[PDB]
């Protein structure tokens, strides 16, 4: 009697990965045609909405290829939010009936609201992006770029049609803020959007604990990242020293927001100070919300571990958040995800250094971005070797579904009839 949520999660991704991979090889979608590994990498990047590119999205793909790319990252981003919310609903249904045996809307309405929320969010971002690019690029081309980037931003994909992804719009508030708002709400999570939508009149105090965590941790994650990036890169001529005072803050805020899974870059991370790469690595690992279009280990997982640590250092018996106790299984889930993620990350970084030769900071940054699904590159993907591409594909797949799958493994372990005696192991 073990849970089957893990199997639905993997089969769903691979059930779309393989069809997407074979389509990209056809010359209809590529001007030159993609090899099997390149198409497998591109499909995995699109389906996981990582946004890593072995080839340039704007140039190597045709008009039909970009339309396919929008479909893949809409399936990868909104599809995870739709599936994760669907599996969350069924988990609650099983839990609710279990309580009644011992002692809410239907699924269709929930799925309709998720797709409705996605299209309206993209449509709002669509008109703002159209408002600027249509005058510059014409009508027919202007709407396409607005639609491609609004879909990419909401799905936390980071795919861009420009050679340098949004590096020409560092000093453009309308493009930066429209994109920033898109993956912030796209990455916030439908449970947070839904709870605020139905219970805002009650007040912040009566929102669900998960909603309160996401509504508080996200601004601090944005604010701390914005201040830290600005402080560490204000004097760096190569990235932010040449911008105006407002331009620096706009760039610092953009990368602070884009790190949490979007993957767009107003500046060059290739020329970032090391103390800034370490800050962004932490930001990428934390990721977006739990039931959103993108994410890494997720904000709530980091928040529980952050306050579990604070509880442990103060020797308190219970982990408390917003006058609510976080039960020990939840704490174990959050700590296990971080430890398991580090185990896979360390193995992936070690393999990358063997297949291709690069510095540790370049390898570590690329491994985190692929695992955290952010897709920000520090120059490793440009020179990635053939075996390195295979590792990145696996890391992108595991990083996309790992935290969610491992959570459901912890939720429903296989029941057993044989238990061994408890014995103590010394730790510390």
């Amino acid at each position: 009697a073990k849970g089957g949520e893990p199997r639905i999660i993997l089969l769903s991704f691979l059930g779309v990965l393989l069809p997407s991979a074979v389509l990209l090889t056809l010359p209809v979608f590529s001007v030159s045609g993609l090899s099997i590994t390149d198409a497998l990498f591109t499909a995995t990047s699109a389906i996981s909405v990582t946004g890593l590119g072995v080839v340039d999205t704007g140039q190597h793909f045709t008009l039909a290829g970009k339309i396919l790319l929008m479909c893949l990252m809409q399936i990868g981003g909104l599809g995870q939010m739709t599936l994760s919310a669907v599996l969350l609903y069924m988990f609650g249904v099983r839990l609710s009936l279990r309580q009644q045996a011992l002692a809410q809307v239907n699924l269709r309405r929930l799925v309709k609201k998720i797709v409705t929320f996605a299209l309206v969010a993209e449509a709002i971002g669509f008109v703002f992006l159209s408002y600027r690019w249509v005058p510059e690029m014409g009508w027919q081309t202007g709407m396409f770029y607005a639609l491609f980037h609004s879909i990419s931003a909401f799905n936390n994909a980071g795919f861009a049609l420009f050679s340098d992804s949004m590096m020409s719009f560092v000093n453009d508030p309308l493009v930066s803020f429209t994109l920033a708002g898109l993956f912030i709400f796209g990455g916030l999570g439908f449970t947070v959007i839904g709870d605020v939508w139905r219970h805002w009149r009650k007040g912040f105090h009566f929102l669900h604990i998960h909603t309160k965590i996401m509504l508080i941790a996200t601004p601090l994650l944005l604010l701390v990242g914005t201040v830290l990036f600005w402080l560490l890169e204000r004097h760096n001529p190569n990235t932010m020293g040449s911008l105006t005072t407002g331009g620096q803050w706009l760039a610092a805020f953009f990368q602070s927001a884009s790190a949490r899974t979007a993957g767009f870059n107003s500046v060059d991370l290739t020329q970032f100070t090391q103390p800034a790469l370490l800050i962004m690595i932490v930001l990428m690992l934390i990721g977006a919300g739990s039931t959103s279009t993108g994410g890494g280990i997720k904000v709530s997982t980091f928040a529980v571990a952050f306050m579990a640590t604070w509880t442990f250092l103060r020797q308190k018996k219970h982990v408390v958040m917003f006058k609510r106790t976080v039960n020990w299984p939840t704490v174990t889930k959050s700590l296990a995800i971080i430890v398991v993620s580090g185990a896979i990350l360390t193995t992936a970084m070690f393999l990358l250094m063997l297949t291709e030769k690069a510095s540790f900071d370049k390898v570590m940054f690329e491994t985190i971005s692929a695992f955290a699904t952010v897709g920000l590159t520090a120059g490793l993907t440009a020179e990635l070797s053939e075996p390195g591409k295979y590792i990145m594909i696996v890391v992108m797949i595991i990083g996309r579904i790992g935290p969610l799958t491992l959570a459901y493994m912890l939720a429903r372990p296989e029941p057993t009839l044989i238990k061994y005696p408890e014995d103590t192991v010394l730790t510390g």
Binding site: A1, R94, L97, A101
Partner: protein, 132 residues
């Protein structure tokens, strides 16, 4: 042809097993997940649901079923309330299992078509088998 069994205890599971052997579609529904899994291999469709919930009974279109058997024994109030909800659901034939004489009185007045008392009913037959 098409039957529904609510409550998958010892009595209810026995109904499901014999009904399947005669090649009939049986909808086995029980609040407890473990009991539904036991009948999952003996019925056409096994569903975990609370048949005291009026909207749940509406979704499970029990009016389409020829006969509905309520086999809830321990909680007298659930069997009485589930019987009523099945009546407003449009079920023409409702068979209810009752463990006590007082429960069998209430079920008769609320409209159950057949009241089954396994101890009393088995008592009569076992005597008849003893006689012949």
């Amino acid at each position: 042809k098409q039957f529904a069994v609510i409550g998958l205890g010892r009595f209810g599971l026995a109904v499901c097993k014999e009904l399947q052997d005669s090649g009939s579609q049986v909808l086995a529904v029980d609040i407890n997940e473990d009991r539904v899994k036991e009948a999952a291999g003996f019925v056409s469709q096994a569903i975990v649901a609370n048949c005291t919930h009026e909207e749940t009974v509406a979704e499970l279109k029990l009016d389409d079923y020829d006969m509905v058997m309520i086999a809830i024994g321990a909680d007298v109030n659930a069997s009485i309330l589930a019987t009523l909800i099945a009546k407003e659901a449009g079920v023409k034939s409702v068979w209810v299992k009752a463990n006590d004489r007082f429960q069998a009185r209430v079920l008769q007045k609320i409209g159950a078509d057949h009241i089954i008392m396994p101890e009393r009913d088995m008592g009569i037959r076992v005597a008849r088998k003893m006689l012949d």
